[PDB]
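Case study.
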Amino acid sequence: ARYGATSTNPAKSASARGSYLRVSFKNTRETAQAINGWELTKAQKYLEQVLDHQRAIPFRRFNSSIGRTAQGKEFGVTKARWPAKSVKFVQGLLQNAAANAEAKGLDATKLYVSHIQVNQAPKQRRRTYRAHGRINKYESSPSHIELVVTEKEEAVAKAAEKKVVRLTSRQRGRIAAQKRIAA
Amino acid sequence: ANLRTQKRLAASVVGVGKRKVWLDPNETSEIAQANSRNAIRKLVKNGTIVKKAVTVHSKSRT
Amino acid sequence: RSKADRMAKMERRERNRHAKQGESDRHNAVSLSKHLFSGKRGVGKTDFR
Amino acid sequence: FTNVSAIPSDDFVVQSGEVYLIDLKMASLEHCTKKGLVTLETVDSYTGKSHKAGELIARPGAYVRDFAQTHILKLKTSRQLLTKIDKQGVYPFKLSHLSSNFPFVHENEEELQSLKKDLKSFRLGMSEISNNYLCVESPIQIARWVPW
Amino acid sequence: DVVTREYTINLHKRLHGVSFKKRAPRAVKEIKKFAKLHMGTDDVRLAPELNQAIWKRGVKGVEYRLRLRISRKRNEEEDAKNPLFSYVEPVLVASAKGLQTVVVEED
Amino acid sequence: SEKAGHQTSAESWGTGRAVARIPRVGGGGTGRSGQGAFGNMCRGGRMFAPTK
RNA sequence: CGUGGAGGUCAGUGACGAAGCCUAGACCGUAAGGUCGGGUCGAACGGCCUCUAGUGCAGAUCUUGGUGGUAGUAGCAAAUAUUCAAAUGAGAACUUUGAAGACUGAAGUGGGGAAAGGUUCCACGUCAACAGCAGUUGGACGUGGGUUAGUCGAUCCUAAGA
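After joint prediction, the assembly is written out as follows.
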């Protein structure tokens, strides 16, 4: 439990959480950044396309020393990849998200990802060997993924927070004079 | 599933190396179930495993 | 029986985090190397190639 | 998950063209202070459970083979008796039910002793069958009463 | 639409200037891609006889002009991809030249 | 206790490129091999001016 | 001014939440600091007069523990090497079989052994941990089976030696 930022009522939204999955944390982070702010089915077809290896996941944070692609122009960046393992893991995550959304029976036609969260996990520390018998670390970067999906509703057009006007005596007199003269 | 054990046992009971054992992909349930020397003997009598005798090493030009 | 299986599955978690080969592997690690953190590499008989 | 109808107590319309079996067993009630429950308790054959004034120990003799599992064993006698019981129908049977001299054309004791000398090997092979998974023991129940 | 149209293939078109070590794997990849482009499917399967024919001359000596045929088959049930399916099959000819693509009627 | 902070056989390894001069217990595979002792700046070491 | 403890004192504070912790929230002191409000918290804790000390860290190539950037970079390049089909399987460049190609070329990558290794041999179910990659596989995991000497070696004898 203890989900992250849920800027909405759970009664009109769904949540999914995956923990302790052996995935590249940085690739998971960039994929999550790409995914967020979209719609469920649109993201589904996008990740299917990524698995089909025609579109690419862009690079936002850890985007150094990466070869150029011929298709980064879609999002305006020149760094992109196809992280298959994280791709299929987020495939499963979004799939179970949609499944539990159907189970709770809210309108799936207007479901879009509201919040995403990718965070680090306790490192897996192997033991490798180097020159002259040195012992160093072999650290994996396991991740934790959290998704909060919401159905887009209609915004309320009401404008609250009406200001209260305070005017000096001279200003009130000027306003009264303008009222009596504007005829 | 796994057939290396059956192949090794058949090779040993026949008396030839484990590379000289033939199997039928069409009929595999019986050979999978078989795990005894009597079973291997009866199936090779049935003819499901061939001997695939030694390759030709001619000496005519010599 | 299911409770015991669950207990074993949970208990193996710490060794999995430690990346030990199993419940039996306990190969420790030395903090520093005598042959890698001492000596003066002057002319003549070198410390090592 | 059991592939049974689980007492479909609603539909029992009797229709022709078939056969039926009616088997009723009733348990007497001795002097009991109040009503309780009557059930069946299995019987082992190891004598290592406990000691009671009315504890029964016996080895069941009825056995059946589940044809679903196919496997081979490691004894000539076991193979022979497995094939013989395969020839025999799929129903509970006793070891003595297998005998080349079973019909007993004439009553005497040489036939009996030959039957026993065959039954020794048959019992050994049956023990091998039980040691592997190629048979099921026939449970023996005792009606015992426990207050609610 | 189950069809059978025996095509012709030359290896020299797509195996020129490639590493001697991977001549046969390159031939296999080019053959499957050629079938893909000339059919328009997603699933392509090769024939053991064709594998024997391509490897038979040698690992680094595959013959140039090989005759093959492509068969469309409807995929079995519970196939989430499509009914489309291509299967290749070799056939030997007396002379490599003098032949062109010919559709063979089902019989 | 007087014997406290004394059941060690640490020796200094001398001036080093990236190792301090605090004596450290020798050997290998002990876990503490290469850790300082006998001093108030080391784990489990003796206390400055023991309360006699 | 601050901290661990002791003696008294405030018929001291405390499950209507004490200590601890976070806080671009509010006050006081020139300051070390103190008080309060707010959030989590679940069991003890302060002011006043003295006494007592293992009592106040930014460092010492300080010790222990934890984690960063360099970075998804270097790299995963000796031994000439793999291909297709089928089956299992949620999932197959690597598991099994079949169909091909290969190499070791008998001072072998074979067949035995000696030191050493000590259950790794093998069977069955199973793959979170490992086989830097995946593993449906294993020299991995869990449960069991298996070595039969009047003739093989020790035990018998002796050398340089003790």
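Observations recorded in class. Residues 1-5, 7, 17, 22-26, 28, 31, 35 of chain B lie near RNA strand G (CB under 10 Å from a C1'). Residues 4-14 of chain B form the longest helix (11 residues). We will return to this complex in the next lecture.
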